[PDB]
Ligand binder design. Sequence first.
Ligand SMILES: [Cl-]
Length: 155
Amino acid sequence: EIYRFDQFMNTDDYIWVFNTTQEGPKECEKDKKHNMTNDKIIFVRSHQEETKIVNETIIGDFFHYSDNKSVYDGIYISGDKREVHAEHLYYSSEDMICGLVQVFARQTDAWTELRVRGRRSYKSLDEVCRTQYEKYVEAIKHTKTSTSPYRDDCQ
Ligand SMILES: [Cl-]
């Protein structure tokens, strides 16, 4: 029912982008928490340019994306050079290893990301996570493309 973005990011492991519908994604997209209060998270969002890793420090302010004011399902983002303004966790597995995130950027841009806590096989992921994402991907594939920024050999 309820997907807590603050708890999804409450981890010391890397959270990888396993799939995205962003048009021009960099490789090896991942987030790494630096520190966290109840209402705020500082984390490092990195990607790769062939061989070099590029780190961006992100200031994130949790907020209530839905009408439910008891749950932090949204985060306002500063520091993301894709000009991401906000993110919305619309599903996470019970163990919070898998999550689906709507990403909102610039004025009118939006895409979806399948985010995974730690390196693991795609087949091992929460089935609902996988099938919801795959259903969406199949339904929009005529105009929007899903790709995987993740490689095993990402740093
Ligand atoms: Cl895009």
